Symmetry: D2
Subunit: 726 residues, 4 copies
């Protein structure tokens, strides 16, 4: 027995805040969290406790420490079948990673609609407010490999597998409402341009290189999503604090056959929140797994990520009433023109057991729709339908990928397909064809109907010649980037300018920079001049005379496009760093932890070493991490309680901890003699907005601090940070 | 509803003789035949009746007759995900075939020992006469593809998967007691030589071509198994009527650690029986699926194939007592020197449900042993141990092939292996490594012991230098071919001579034939001269003075090596053709069928067309096949009842039916005016042995016939067939 | 030296009638027969005479008869990399066979048009009577596996790969002018019906079983091709003595953008000739490789298959 | 076999030897080399046994393992000297 007698090796099977316990597989951490999909996976789950170590053939292994050899110092013998099996499996562990979105993090949950949508869709999972549909959701980046970092500047993926009673429905979206390109034929072109360059495979997880901006400068259709990626949208605080969109216009079909155009939205319950770039870039080095960890730990804490599903709904006769083409995925539908209507809510409440088996092997594909839903002629969606079935043949080893447990439907599935690599199902049907008499033609077709019917495509009208040709209605590239730009706050605009500037500064060929600046001058001259200034470029008089693009159906801004314009913050699930000293004033800490617990805010107690310290009243305080081990990048605010401040007053890591949080605009709270730290951040004796300070942490100290946290960051501090050396 | 109203599309779920019902998947034909492995497969068995036709994602299909197109005479649309999923799966149905033994047929069954064997082995499946071990057995040829024919001249494989309580044990044997080569390094060379030649991929399923006999002429070690292949052993009547051998010497390990050398035998309860060459070769054309079909139909009729397992046992101190090396797999152990001792019996009593899922995907490997068994230094076996693990990585798509359902153990298996393509099992173990504290080191090693202990290799002494070198004790090539030859009956010897003669006639390069004849002269000069005469070769004076090889430890012959020297014929399961006419004598047919049923001999009623005829007493007789439809190749004897014999007397197909069966030495019985047919086979009025004849089928008629059948063929007829034009 | 002293191991590199000589690889049997595609393959052709035996890494092997073992009656050692490379490659020799048409026989050749088809198509390989196009042609059955027999009763495939100056053009046809089914959605249903039945994988290379005729009775569209299958068209004397058809209506596009509907045909120079059924069925037993053999040997005789 | 798709990974250009390589191995996924040898086995007479084995020697000779002495029982055991 190698476990410790005190049993401290096993985490408790109950919700615990991040860092209190070792993380564990979901069925062990929360065995009583169940749904119909989790239960169906029990047949393939494998335990371990009280079992013998065997080969894959069931043979008990006596000595798992040594190869078989001719003498204890002799050659290894080919007849060691236990070695060779163990090494063979190891030698073939890896499978191809996803072509795009290879880096991702996933969890189980459930979905439930608010009310029956049977008036607009016959889709069964939206027909009754009491119908609960299990889900599996994978969040992702786009460009980086499976081993790349979480907090890069990138688009994020948001893929939801609905295990419906009438088929698997995959909603395969991103965290922005549009994509970079218009036609699927260009997808390898765009992806090759953004991916690491083919001679040397640099850089990983970054669009800040020549070939990406080269493609953008020559393809202005890309400009809208590029705007989004250069904003703080491209660097989310977590997957819980981002939006989701299906991007394409789809169709809803009701029992009477009426089609309604629809676009899908996920609204985060935790609000919209993003990092700032210096923080996001450094965090890819201090913790490349930050988003993966934060997701797992929130679920282990009970901080279940929640999202409200919503629809923008457009009648068929309104197809042409907007300036933009509904079928153009580089165009958004402003919520000011078509509101998002609440449909239901999704809760992610259990982690997987084995990342490889459940996350890496999961297969999402937007062609996986159910009766009540249908496609449109969006030329990007159209080509997606081919790719997501095709790519699985190599990634997941063949055509039986639906038999891998995480991908199996929970509803019945029967047909006349047979064979293929690693076929699990053993068909007893006398027939493998239809029409057949020898099994009385079963399984049988089902006619279309209002529920439990067969799938039939909406009989939309088609008219035109066979052409490789872009619809002229698509050939407008600058109005929607402008609408986005004007909808941002001034500090969000600053960050957009700084994103473009930082990225173009790493383009080596200067003529590429100049061509991207010229495209910006077609969007907004304020934006283009600000970027040009940082690049040492001067706009020509002709460029200064570029007429701006028209408004979007009269709109000159839409505050739903901004992260922060309308407050939607939420402190539940946020984390505060508490910086300890060797004789902490316990009255401060008790007030701090009481206020944080009331709002569901977590705390990390940090010191210069691990182990424990003792407060003034003798209370023993366990240390979560060092100052260097858990930098301010990983928390939302910093609190410094009173006590023996001289212990850390001249500690470089303690001082830098506050300087980093200050530069990154986070709230900071100083109690008693901890107010001496204002000098390291150059805060005058009069104080300033964003620095909570008082004689002690009792009173309004923590309400000021929690109000600041509900506002996410202290945007008013931005003029002051450029003098801070951090 | 497409099935007929009389319900005649569905086979009866009861035992029925061959031809009486349509064949069916095992679980529908015999739902009440069960064992633990069959039951454990119910989780992956898929039904069909009363289920909707769906996609693999569970979506119900409305129209499975048409692609989705723009207009009903327009182009097919990329958005048809139902089409593309169906075609994709079809497009990827095939997996690589087995490098060797690609043609095979398999069945489920069970094994049971006669008594406890714990004095000599601690193997759990041999420990208790009431311990029942499920099995899955695949019989195979060697050379041809999965699409090649059954009744070729080849070696047969005989692979048994024992689903043991202490792990999978695969006994992977052949139907002869030796192999062609000594060291596994030569296996690709031998196999390439016997397989179709690389320029043009000819010939399929035949050793009768230049490169095979080239290798043989240059590799005398091959001569022993070549002798078996040229004998009638190479063309068995059924998989039920052949022997089985593990070939290599293995070890039995008992609980006190004593090692006993062992070779494995399967003795067929139905006795030993083979075809003749002209019959077997023509049958590869008339029914290339004859062995597969006969196996399947015997099981559906209740004629379960049965084999007795037996051990040749040799104490460790006797390793060097014999003239041959025990570890040399081209040498057999004569039963006259070391008898085969009975161990238990194996019954094959249910067919699979899906050939591809269960047969094609099954993975046998002789390195799959269990505690109580161990290997030896046999250099052919030693290399096999590498190959059967390695080949599955491409054939079965990766290292998780044990998770394919037919291959799964029925006992526990738990280890720290993870991932790999198609990974089914979801591991909940906090640890994927040992030693580990975080799961208190589970799953754990198990010390070896008398039962339920870990595997430990027998600590055999090893002494020598690292050499690529053949043991001198292996350098003897002719003694065992001679033993075999001399142990054969005169008619068996004639068939061997004609085997060699027919094959070498197909060798294009005459010098190869000459070199093979020189090798035979080192075996036996009677054999060598007979073959040479058929090839137009004249043995030189020196070849005539080649000294024959020595006896095998004083043994000059061993009747256990003959198919027929010791009678072991059994008639149950054999088939008789009955040649009808349009007014059969019903008293004859009544007595024929009553006697055949009394011994378990099946019958098929043949005529010049399908449908029915009526007998003289009004009885309606259903026709099973036409004369050409089911040739005499496919039956064991022929009976011609009395009646309107003129109806068929001048029918060429009916006359040829008898001539073919006569040429191939099968018994023929003729009643009443049927005796008129003696003219077509040139039998004199006073009859001859092997032709049953009487005024009616009454009396000793059917007893005479069944007596001939138990003797298999009428060997005395051989001198008469050479003048028969058939 | 293991060859006979009289050199009778080696076939002559000149045309010879069937059975006169051992068959041989084409570039050894007819090295003067060349086209642009055959010549472009010289970069990957591998010799053998006067070379040492090596591993795939180029290491010369001293003893290709024995595994490395601890003593000559000892266990085989894991460090024998020469064994494991040789057995590894052997162990992975097979690739999946074609889903349909798995059984087939192929040869090289060339094509040239009689006159310029410029008026009706701008296809380059049809623009100049002096323009030679290399081809590779595979003939096949449909139902049986790669190891099934040649003279079965089946449709035959007739696939031609044209290596034109403006791209590969594959003309993938059969020996009857129609097919069994109308819509590609039904192709796995039809193929599953004609193929060996799923429970026991019987019969090989035959449509003479329940599921095939079950489908046919329920799908009258199949009857036309079934009629060709049941005729002597289904058992050709040789690949040289059958027709070929593209089946589908395609289009020809000229330089003016005018489309012409076209159906493709191959007309055998040797004429149309078929076996009879009892003959064909017995021949799948006496020589299951009859058609592959006959094509190879006709070419070695200089008796080249030709099709218009 | 899984990482590079099969046993012909030596034919991927970066992995190819620059020296001659010839043996009797054939086929496998994505086979590039087109073998003209009449024989795919040895010993063979039909190509006069080419390509042929080479005895070990001072230069350009075949590979032979150093004939080190081996002495001991078949054991799964760490040498005490490693402890
Ligand atoms: C025609 C090609 C193509 C195009 C135009 C798109 N995608 Fe895609 N996408 C793929 C081809 C693809 C893929 C290559 O098929 C992936 C990679 C691995 C996979 O299974 O699917 C994939 C993966 C993938 C994933 C990750 C799913 C997972 O977690 O496994 C997401 C979230 C998206 N895509 C979302 C989108 C969105 C929102 C698009 C624009 C509207 C989009 N893709 C356009
Ligand atoms: C070192 C290579 C090697 C050598 C020397 C042998 N075999 Fe083998 N055998 C294989 C390598 C192999 C293989 C390539 O690994 C196969 C083909 C596909 C497979 O799964 O195993 C196989 C298949 C195979 C099968 C078919 C199993 C099934 O039905 O799936 C049988 C019955 C045998 N072998 C029996 C033998 C016997 C009785 C041998 C001589 C004693 C023998 N093999 C030598
Ligand atoms: C939608 C599926 C489908 C349909 C409707 C057809 N085929 Fe096909 N065919 C295939 C799917 C396929 C395939 C599965 O893609 C094959 C098997 C493996 C391959 O490479 O192509 C093939 C092989 C194949 C070959 C073998 C090529 C070779 O020698 O390698 C020929 C000659 C044909 N087909 C001809 C036809 C003809 C004349 C058809 C009717 C007009 C036809 N096929 C319908």
């Amino acid at each position: 027995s190698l476990a410790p007698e005190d049993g401290s090796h096993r985490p408790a099977a109950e919700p615990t805040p991040p860092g209190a316990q070792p993380t564990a597989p979901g069925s062990l951490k929360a065995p009583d969290t169940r749904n119909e999909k989790l239960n169906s996976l029990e047949d393939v789950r494998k335990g371990s406790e009280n079992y013998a170590l065997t080969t894959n053939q069931g043979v008990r292994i006596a000595d798992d420490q040594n190869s078989l050899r001719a003498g204890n110092r002799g050659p290894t013998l080919l007849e060691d079948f236990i070695l060779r099996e163990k090494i063979t499996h190891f030698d073939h562990e890896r499978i191809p990673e996803r072509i795009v979105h290879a880096r991702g993090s996933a969890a189980h949950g459930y979905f439930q609609p608010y009310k029956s949508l049977s008036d607009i869709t016959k889709a069964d999972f939206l027909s009754d407010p009491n119908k609960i549909t299990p889900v599996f959701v994978r969040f992702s980046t786009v460009q980086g490999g499976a081993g790349s970092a979480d907090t890069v500047r990138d688009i994020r993926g948001f893929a939801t597998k609905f295990y419906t009673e009438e088929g698997i429905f995959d909603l395969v979206g991103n965290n922005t409402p549009i994509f970079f390109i218009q036609d699927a034929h260009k997808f390898p072109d765009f992806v090759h341009a953004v991916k690491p360059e083919p001679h040397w495979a640099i850089p990983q997880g970054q669009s800040a290189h020549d070939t990406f901006w080269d493609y953008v400068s020559l393809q202005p259709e890309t400009l809208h999503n590029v705007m989004w990626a250069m904003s703080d949208r491209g660097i989310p605080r977590s997957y819980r604090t981002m939006e989701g969109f299906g991007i394409h216009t789809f169709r809803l079909i009701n029992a009477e056959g009426k089609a309604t155009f629809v676009r899908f939205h996920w609204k985060p319950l935790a609000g919209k929140a993003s990092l700032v770039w210096d923080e996001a870039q450094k965090l890819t080095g201090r913790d490349p797994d930050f988003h993966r960890r934060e997701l797992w730990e929130a679920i282990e804490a009970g901080d279940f990520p929640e999202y409200e599903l919503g629809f923008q709904l457009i009648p068929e006769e309104d197809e042409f009433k907007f300036d933009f083409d509904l079928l153009d995925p580089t165009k958004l539908i402003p919520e000011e023109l078509v509101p998002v209507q609440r449909v239901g809510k999704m809760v992610l409440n259990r982690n997987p057991d084995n990342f490889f088996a459940e996350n890496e092997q999961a297969a999402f594909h937007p062609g996986h729709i159910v009766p009540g839903l249908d496609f449109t002629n969006d030329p990007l969606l159209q080509g997606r339908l081919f790719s997501y079935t095709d790519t699985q043949i190599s990634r997941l080893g063949g055509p039986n990928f639906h038999e891998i447990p995480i991908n199996r439907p929970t509803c019945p599935y029967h047909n006349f397909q047979r064979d293929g690599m690693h076929r699990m199902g053993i068909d007893t049907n006398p027939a493998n064809y239809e029409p057949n008499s020898i099994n009385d033609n079963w399984p049988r077709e089902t006619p279309p109907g209002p529920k439990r019917g067969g799938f039939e495509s909406y009989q939309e009208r088609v008219e035109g010649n066979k052409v490789r040709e872009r619809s002229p209605s698509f050939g407008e590239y600058y109005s929607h980037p402008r609408l986005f730009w004007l909808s941002q706050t001034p500090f969000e605009q600053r960050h957009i300018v700084d994103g473009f500037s930082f990225e173009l500064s790493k383009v080596v060929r200067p003529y590429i920079r100049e061509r991207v600046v010229d495209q910006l001058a077609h969007i907004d001259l304020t934006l283009a001049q600000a970027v040009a200034k940082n690049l040492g470029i001067e706009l020509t008089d002709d460029q200064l005379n570029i007429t701006p693009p028209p408004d979007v159906n009269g709109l000159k801004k839409d505050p739903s496009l901004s992260l922060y314009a309308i407050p939607d913050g939420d402190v539940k699930g946020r984390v505060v760093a508490i910086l300890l000293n060797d004789e902490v004033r316990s009255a401060d800490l008790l007030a701090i932890l009481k206020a944080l617990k009331a709002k569901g805010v977590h705390a990390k107690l940090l010191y210069s070493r691990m182990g424990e310290v003792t407060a003034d009243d003798g209370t023993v305080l366990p240390i979560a991490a060092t100052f260097a081990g858990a930098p301010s990048l990983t928390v939302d605010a910093v609190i410094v309680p009173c006590g023996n401040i001289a212990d850390i007053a001249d500690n470089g890591d303690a001082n830098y901890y506050l300087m980093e949080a200050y530069k990154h605009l986070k709230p900071i709270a100083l109690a008693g003699d901890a107010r001496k730290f204002k000098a390291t951040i150059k805060i005058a004796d009069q104080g300033e907005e964003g620095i909570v300070e008082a004689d002690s942490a009792d009173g309004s100290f923590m309400d000021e601090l929690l109000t600041l946290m509900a506002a996410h960051r202290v945007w008013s501090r931005i003029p002051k940070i450029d003098k801070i050396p951090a």
